Design a protein around this nucleic acid. Structure first.
Lengths: 170, 227, 188
RNA sequence: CUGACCGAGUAGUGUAGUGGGUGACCAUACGCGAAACUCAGGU
RNA sequence: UUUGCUCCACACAAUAUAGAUGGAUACGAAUAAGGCGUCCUUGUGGCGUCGCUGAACCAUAGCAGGCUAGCAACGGUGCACUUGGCGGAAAGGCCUUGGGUGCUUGCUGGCGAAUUGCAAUGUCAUUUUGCGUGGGGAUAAAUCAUUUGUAUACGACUUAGA
RNA sequence: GCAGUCAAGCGACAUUGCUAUGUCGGCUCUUCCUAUCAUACCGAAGCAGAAUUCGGUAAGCGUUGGAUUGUUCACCCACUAAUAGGGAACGUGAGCUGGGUUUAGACCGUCGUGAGACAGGUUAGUACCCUACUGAU
RNA sequence: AAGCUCGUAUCAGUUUUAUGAGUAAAUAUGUAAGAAGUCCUUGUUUAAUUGAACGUGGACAUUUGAAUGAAGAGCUUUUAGUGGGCCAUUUUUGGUAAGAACUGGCGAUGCGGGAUGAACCGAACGUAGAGUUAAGGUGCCGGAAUACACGCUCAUCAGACACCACAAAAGGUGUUAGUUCAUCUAGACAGCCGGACGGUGGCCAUGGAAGUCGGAAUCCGCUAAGGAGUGUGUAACAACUCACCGGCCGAAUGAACUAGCCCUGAAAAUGGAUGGCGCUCAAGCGUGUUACCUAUACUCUACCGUCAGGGUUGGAUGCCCUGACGAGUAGGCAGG
RNA sequence: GAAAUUGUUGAAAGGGAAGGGCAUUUGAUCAGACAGGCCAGCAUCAGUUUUGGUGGCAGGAUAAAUCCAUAGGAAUGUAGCUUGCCUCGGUAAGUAUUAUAGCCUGUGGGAAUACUGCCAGCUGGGACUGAGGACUGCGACGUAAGUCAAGGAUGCUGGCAUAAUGGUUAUAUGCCGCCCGUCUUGAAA
């Protein structure tokens, strides 16, 4: 269900006069190992002259979050291919982990820009330990000290189809 | 999409930008050492011709004006950051629209000239009353036989802004009763000041004032305050 | 960006006091009282020191922020009217036909009567709204003053007075006869 | 006149979508995949 | 018309059910606010309390709910009367004085269940209609024919004649 | 349109000289559209008045009588606030009119040796069934 | 349809190995992957059995010459219907808006979905029982969650699922998110007020034209700044006011560009249709995560029939076991 | 002495069509057999299938974490202190890296849980099917005799013995269904 992070390394299978290539690696976000390997191959074929037939995955390992329970301001750089020419996009997402940040980013791109998974390229994701460098207001507002806000217009759910109390909110 | 539109026009002049302020800062810094005496004047409101006449009413000297904060930066707003000996104190006294007259003739002479320099000024005074009939260009302050009736073009200005209940039948501007514009010895309101300025009643007078002086050899602020 | 919370400060002078319940709002002071039904705006009020009141909107958009700001403006206008009051001076001028303005108690409603507008035989009656005092200016020719605690009522009456004398089928550049406002200052 | 992680995994092309786009066209996944060209050498 | 209609009581049938198998349990307004108790110098007042569902309230034990003996209360409640009321939006319903008659599982006892044989919905209500008994109330209309036309192709319509 | 002109984007706006081969038409009838001729209400126009131009919503109503075309082409007189444009098989043959188109006879011009044909002009010609609607048991 | 000769049979609408064919790919197109093959030796046109050719002796039988699959291969007789089909995909041509070459469908086709459809998505059909799915849906009609989670919409003809009967550029001071400049706590923008100067009422035309009815121009002196003056303007002036500068106001603001939703762009005639009801933190849009409804499809089983492989000397065309399958117009055969 | 068509009697339905198909309720009608015919329940079973509980393991950075010990750093600055008036216990800005909160980073330490796959591990409930018809065979439990969930259901019980189940049909309702033949690339036209 949730996105997974895998470290994928390609070998570019060696031959005589071409021994032990540099073993290029990448960080890939995918739901499963197969999709991660497919995305790694797609990126590698574009980056330099390599192919699945003439290459292999050295090793794939899931990158578990170092601190799964910690609020972080993740800086996001994304290249998305719209109907017109593609352009760069920088976003910040306050999330608990890289996986959650990427999952929220995918939904945000799909909604606010109609950018599908095929058209989304993850340039880089970096945790922002500093506070003065945050540039996005919608994430900055949440950094105020002793922040407290209400939940007006609370709506409850009813199991029975008929209610006699005529309920209210809060 | 809803944002305020700009009424900018293709004028023949553009903003000077930050370069002018930086240049003036360096000019002030150089003048601080070029000349002997320095002063911190107050010229919150003065007509340009008055300043031009001042700039040529004395021998070779430099009258330096500029942004208040720029002048403070040139002088320095802290004792540790002061450019010269105790120059921070001189900057501390700069409150309004200040200017510096860099000259070396005599400390007493400069203050005496400031005291004796007086010229006509607007209200920004004695009470005045408009004539009960046709209003003249000077608002009755001179004989009607010499003045000329006010131009009808400015009647909308009189009605909408000056609050005077003017009417135009036989469109030479006329009023139904005498109108009191200013009282005795009071700071006139913006509307009253504009009314007096339009009538050309420059009853007030302006005299240059200085808060303090400085000398390159005294190494301290000459805390002399005259108006 | 759906601000988490935005608010504006309302300054209440010591003389007047305001008691706030569900969005029906009441203002009381030396010049009487005023009320308004703000239930359509969906804003929240809060007491600070009985001298300043904050209106806060949580998770409100740009339209909600504008609604909050106009609520603050309306509250300030109500406070000013209760404290100072408004004096909408109106003037009427004519070229040939002297316009006659009078107050008549026709139907017990204190209708304003206008006659001889450009020689028209029709006589228009403008219903005077509640809480807007009307008095003819003294020693000022062809001037009428409209005053009242509520800005809305006084402004509406002033607009109606000028709208009745609307020139029809004639060149507005020549027929200067009409009713117009001349001032919008406070009674104080 | 030969080699090359050199053009370049670019152009081009088979297969699939109830993929996007009114249209022109475009992207994805399973594959194939060049030449002119570049460096050096040859003559 | 030799006793028809209608109402009430009592007895068998048919006739079915858009579908019982404890109770359709009654303020109003808002949801960027409310219900309840309390207090005051009664208001858009102060205090405490509650929601986060009815997963509640009432009621619920006896051969589909028998026959009998006492205790303590004088309450609970079905039935027919009875006194004073309210309800017209489709009122046909909602209040209450007075006793009478029961049951009372509020509390404690005496006898009976069997064999429907290991379950077979195991029949326990409401809508209509007629004949079989007793008691209450009164003894009319329309159509056809004719007839005048405010009417009409014919119907129909407007009228009159014991 | 032809042949140019400069240039924000990847060629918009502006810019230079001249420049009938078909049959549909008319009397009555009902309805619909606005791209508004007239009427209601308004804004801008050298609206001083009067008169007039354009523009905005608005289809309720009104949008004619005649010289005259068979006519498809389509022009004039007069009244009226005006005499606006269209659709319903460019509605309306078991509604009418056959007006025009189109059989069998016949006259004039061309060709064709001939019979005949036209590039052509003229003449004379064959609901009582169901439903809907209006009334009515 | 009738069959005939052989039988493990050579084959394949498929791939791999080798290479022709192409400045030049890809898809395809050609040949081979050998027992009917290879090798040593030797018999019966060259000067010479030198060599071709067909024989004998000898060497290898099947990891015997790649992968995968094969209700077998070849052969003979005869004939019922069509010889004009239509739709869709690729390539080429033509083209403001059809002609040749390819393959799959309908015609001959049921069943579920798109409210229905000949060209679409699934899936091809014996009669029955149970379960799981396909496309399509989970507000009601309508069997399934007013499912969960993240963002957008106020539309006075919104929106609501490819073929389907379809418009954009462009405009909007509607709304959401991004890219780059430009000024910023020695003071960004809004707002307040003050300055906005002298030569010069610059040269021409003038009756007036002085910053403004006009022509060419557009500089000097001082500034923090001030344009021989951006406009309003009185017959000229003047005055007002714009650019610009000074202060108070005290934290981001301003310009252009990009792409998510909405309106215009997308104007007719009987009254009308996302299918209707109908909906707005949607029951609309993009995307993610789960459980749910089912076709004559798939999985398990009962039965009729067709076909195939075996058993049967004690009703033989007979009886028993096993396995696969059941579409269909013209038409053929067989059994009734 | 047939159908098309018509009348009388009995039954049934009928709100702008009828007729037909799968499916059941109601009305009518109807055949059969009982030292063993029709309809069901329970127990354990062979096959298919659906939904729960629960236990042991195989991998992750021998999961990541959390937690613990250690060194360091920081503010959306904890205590304390200085300034400020003072709502005399207030909070505004300076200092202050744990003090009268704690947070983060690197290292090291002992565990589980999450995800994933396996179990020729156990077990509850629901639905359909009972096909074959004396043995022969493959297997398991037993020292053996024998037994068994091992090449297709047995054991017990109850009601009815009839219109009770069931068939035919009249008609009630859930859904669907266009008018037959020929021709046409295509028809209901």
């Amino acid at each position: 269900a949730h996105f997974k992070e895998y470290q994928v390394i390609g070998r570019r299978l060696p031959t005589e006069s071409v021994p032990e290539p540099k073993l290029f690696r990448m960080r890939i976000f995918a739901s499963n190992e197969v999709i991660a390997k497919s995305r790694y191959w797609y990126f590698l074929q574009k980056l330099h002259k390599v192919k699945k037939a003439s290459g292999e995955i050295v090793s794939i390992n899931q990158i578990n979050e170092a601190h799964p329970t910690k609020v972080k301001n993740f800086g996001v750089w994304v290249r998305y291919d719209s109907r017109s020419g593609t352009h760069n996009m920088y976003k910040e997402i306050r999330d608990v982990s890289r996986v959650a940040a990427v999952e929220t980013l995918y939904q945000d791109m799909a909604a606010r820009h109609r950018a599908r998974f095929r058209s989304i390229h993850i340039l880089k994701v970096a945790e922002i330990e500093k506070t003065a460098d945050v540039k996005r207001q919608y994430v900055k507002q949440f950094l105020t000290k002793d922040l407290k806000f209400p939940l007006p217009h609370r709506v409850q759910k009813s199991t029975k189809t008929f209610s006699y109390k005529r309920p209210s909110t809060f | 999409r809803s944002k305020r539109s700009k009424l900018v026009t293709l004028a023949q002049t553009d903003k000077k930008g930050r370069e002018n302020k930086e240049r003036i800062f360096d000019e002030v810094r150089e003048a601080l050492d070029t000349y002997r005496y320095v002063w911190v004047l107050h010229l919150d409101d003065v007509r340009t011709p008055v300043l031009q006449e001042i700039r040529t009413s004395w021998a070779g000297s430099k009258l330096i004006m500029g942004k208040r904060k720029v002048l403070q930066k040139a002088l320095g707003e802290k004792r540790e950051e002061e450019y010269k000996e105790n120059l921070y104190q001189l900057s501390k006294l700069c409150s309004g629209v200040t200017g510096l007259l860099f000259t070396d003739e005599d400390v007493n002479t400069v203050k005496e000239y400031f005291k004796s320099y007086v010229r006509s000024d607007y209200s920004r005074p004695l009470t005045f009353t408009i004539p009960e009939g046709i209003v003249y260009s000077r608002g009755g302050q001179i004989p009607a036989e010499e003045d000329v009736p006010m131009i009808h073009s400015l009647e909308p200005t009189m009605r909408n802004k000056f609050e005077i209940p003017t009417k135009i039948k036989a469109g030479k501007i006329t009023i139904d009763s005498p109108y009191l514009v200013c009282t005795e010895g009071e700071k006139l309101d913006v509307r009253q000041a504009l009314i007096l300025k339009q009538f050309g009643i420059a009853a007030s007078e302006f005299k240059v004032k200085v808060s303090a002086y400085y000398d390159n050899d005294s190494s301290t602020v000459e805390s002399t305050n005259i108006n | 960006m759906k601000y988490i919370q935005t608010e504006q400060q309302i300054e209440v002078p010591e003389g007047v006091t305001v008691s706030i319940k569900s969005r029906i709002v009441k203002v009381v002071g030396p010049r009487g009282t005023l009320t308004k039904n703000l239930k359509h705006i969906d804003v929240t009020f809060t007491k600070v020191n009985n001298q300043l009141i904050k209106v806060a909107v949580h998770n409100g958009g740009r339209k909600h922020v504008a609604a909050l700001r106009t609520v603050k403006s309306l509250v300030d206008n109500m406070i000013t009217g209760v404290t100072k009051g408004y004096k909408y001076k109106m003037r009427y001028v004519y070229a040939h036909f002297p316009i006659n303005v009078n107050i008549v108690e026709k139907d017990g409603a204190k209708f304003i009567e206008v006659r001889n507008f450009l020689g028209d035989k029709k006589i228009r009656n403008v219903p005077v709204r509640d809480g807007v005092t009307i008095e003819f200016s003294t020693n000022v020719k062809d001037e009428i003053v409209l005053s009242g605690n509520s800005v809305e009522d006084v402004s509406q009456n002033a607009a109606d007075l000028q709208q009745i004398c609307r020139v029809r089928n004639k060149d507005i550049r020549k027929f200067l006869d009409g009713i117009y406002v001349s001032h919008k200052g406070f009674i104080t």
